[PDB]
């Protein structure tokens with residue numbers, strides 16, 4: 001009632017949030033034929049993401065459809081290596097090792113170990129992202145991260161803090177984030193409520209700046225701050 005696991009013909013993405021909105025039916029349950037109007041309405045209805053930001057994200061998602069100048073995408077188009085999907089994900093392995101779309105327990109265990117507290121703050125988020133970049137560079141001989149991939153990696157850590165939690169304190173309960181990644185269901189039962197205030201492109205930019213500012217390398221090894 002309100003949630004159903006993907007069945008045999010349903011397609012899913014490397015994005016835990018889109019997978020979640022498909023499992024709840026905010027997006028089409030089968031993960032196919034997502035248009036700009038469906039995107040605005042799903043992200044609006046479930047999370048209170050503003051239309052300007054939903055439109056921007058749809059822009060990128062549409063570039064993953066193999067058909068050129070496309071006006072829709074499917075969730076599985078998003079899995080195409082090095083368009084939006086990138087190495088050093090928090091809950092997925094690098095394509096080099098295996099399929100980069102499904103939840104990977106080994107990788108997620110690394111990420112969790114840097115959330116050292118019941119409340120995840122900007123510092124813990126920044127720290128987990130950084131260890132995934134460094135781990136992927138030293139274990140994956142085909143490791144790469146484009147300027148777009150770097151921007152998306154920083155944006156993705158800002159998102160789970162800002163959209164799932166309180167964007168003002170820039171904090172989110174650890175148990176809410178763990179539940180979303182592990183179940184691809186919204187943690188309503190743990191206290192998650194759709195926020196009253198819309199989440200905008202400038203909220204995303206600001207939190208991305210806080211992530212960058214909380215990185216303290218004596219010397220940056222590779223692409224750790226590109227936007």
Ligand code: HEM
Pocket residue numbers: 014015016017018039043047049057058060061078079084085086087088089090091092152156157159160163164
């Ligand atoms: C149309 C909207 C969206 C698109 C097209 C999209 C696309 C993507 C893609 C392609 C990835 C994979 C990047 C990688 O290799 O790690 C991803 C990851 C992610 N997305 Fe989304 N996403 C969208 C909306 C959101 C929203 C609203 C959130 C809010 C919480 C979100 C949270 C995340 C997170 C946390 C990850 C990281 C997963 C991981 O690192 O393992 N996304 N998204």
Ligand SMILES: *[C@@H]1O[C@H](CO)[C@@H](O)[C@H](O)[C@H]1NC(C)=O
Pocket residue numbers: 105106109
């Ligand atoms: C991740 O941690 C769980 C729970 O602590 C542990 O039992 C499991 O073996 C770990 N998974 C991997 C593949 O490391």
Ligand SMILES: *[C@@H]1O[C@H](CO)[C@@H](O)[C@H](O)[C@H]1NC(C)=O
Pocket residue numbers: 137143144145221222223224
């Ligand atoms: C991998 O690490 C080295 C630092 O030894 C750096 O030169 C390179 O840019 C890194 N690759 C990426 C994509 O960050």
Ligand SMILES: C=Cc1ccccc1
Pocket residue numbers: 015152155156159204
């Ligand atoms: C890839 C997911 C994402 C989600 C929100 C903002 C930037 C990126």
Ligand SMILES: [Mg+2]
Pocket residue numbers: 014085086087088089092093094100
């Ligand atoms: Mg990835």
